[PDB]
Amino acid sequence: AEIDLGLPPGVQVGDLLRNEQTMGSLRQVYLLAVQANSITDHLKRFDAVRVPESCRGVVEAQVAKLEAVRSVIWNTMISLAVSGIEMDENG
Amino acid sequence: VSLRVTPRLVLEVNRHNAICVATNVPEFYNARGDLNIRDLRAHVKARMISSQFCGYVLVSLLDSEDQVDHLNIFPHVFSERMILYKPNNVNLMEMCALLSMIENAKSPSIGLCREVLGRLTLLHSKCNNLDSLFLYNGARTLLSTLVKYHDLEEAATPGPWNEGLSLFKLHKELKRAPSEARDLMQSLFLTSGKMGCLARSPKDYCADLNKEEDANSGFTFNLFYQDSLLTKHFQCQTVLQTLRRKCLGSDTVSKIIP
């Protein structure tokens, strides 16, 4: 190549930068994952807490907002899953 | 930031008249986690003086290819990555041995981990070499993967580990998610079809892998590994095929990165 890097047998350059592309994309996916999982933990707390009476509408709408954001998150993950499938030659 | 190659699937390979066996290095430590350096080093010396010793079979993986129990790699590339190592050096030999022992450690305590990293840095200080820098970085990386995944550091103040194999963080994070979404997301990000199916129990797959190719060849490959978060790729049939092929013929190298 243009700069010698200590590389073991299998590793050529093209694999090595392809690696960086995929590591970026899945880095985003991981951020989305831990986000969706914090939100789903807050959901667990709401749904477990019980005791709603007349304050129930506020609680139901806060659950509604959480669940809504989380749906958008999971769909974003799907949406770049498919894109990564578009880069590949077999799919 | 992740241009790092890491050695995976490290076993040691023996051949007694074309009858071949790839084994993990046995555990050299007690139930509390005291690393038996004396017996380990005697093992390594013994494997050097031996004549039925061919070397450590190892593979080189990139971070985005290792999905914990599936491989986002093509089979030809995978074959180019897998080598048969027999270094003309005792310390590199023992480093590969510790790599084997980390991958196949049943459930190490962080005490065994810190001892193992310690012995490793001590060996790597003895050998300035691209092979020792390689063996060391990757062995520390396997160590760190094991701690971060199993919560062995939890203490609060950081130890000298790193993030480990990246997709292992993804693997752990998706097991946490609602059962509904977890299944799909595992199917979409960490189940790469490219290396094909998994066999139910490798040992049987190698036994009939012997039945098929044993008229022309007296060659007989057997595999011994301890099941572990770091050895799940011994379930993959293409893996086992490539492994038998590499162990039975090919060549050896005295230097990984000459």
Residue numbers in the entry:
A (entry chain H): 41 to 131
B (entry chain A): 20 to 173, 175 to 278
What do the authors say?
BBRF2 is an EBV tegument protein that has putative homologues in all three herpesvirus subfamilies. Here, we report crystal structures of BBRF2 alone and in complex with BSRF1. BBRF2 binds EBV capsid protein MCP and capsid-associated protein BPLF1, whereas BSRF1 associates with EBV glycoproteins gB and gH/gL. These data elucidate the molecular basis of the functional association between BBRF2 and BSRF1, suggesting a role of BBRF2-BSRF1 in tethering EBV nucleocapsids to the Golgi membrane during secondary envelopment.
Finally, we obtained crystals of the BBRF2Δ-BSRF1Δ complex and solved its structure at 3.1 Å. In the asymmetric unit, BBRF2Δ and BSRF1Δ formed a 6:6 heterododecamer. Using the PISA server, we found a predominantly large interface area of ~1300 Å2 between BBRF2Δ-1 and BSRF1Δ-1, which we think mediates the constitutive heterodimer observed in solution. Three constitutive heterodimers are associated in a symmetric manner to build up a triangular 3:3 heterohexamer. Two copies of the triangular 3:3 BBRF2Δ-BSRF1Δ heterohexamer stack face-to-face, resulting in a two-layer 6:6 heterododecamer in the asymmetric unit. The antiparallel ɑ6 and ɑ7 of BBRF2Δ join at the middle of ɑA and ɑB of BSRF1Δ, forming a tight heterogeneous four-helix bundle. A massive hydrophobic network stabilizes this helical bundle and constitutes the major interface of the BBRF2Δ-BSRF1Δ complex. Two bulky residues on ɑ7 of BBRF2Δ, Met205 and Phe209, wedge into the hydrophobic niche of BSRF1Δ, and hydrophobic residues from ɑ6 of BBRF2Δ add to this cluster. The proximal end of BSRF1Δ creates a hydrophilic interface with BBRF2Δ via two intermolecular salt bridges and a hydrogen bond. In addition, the N-terminal loop (N-loop) of BSRF1Δ winds toward the central β-sheet of BBRF2Δ, and a bulged 47-LPPGV-51 motif from the N-loop lies inside a hydrophobic groove.
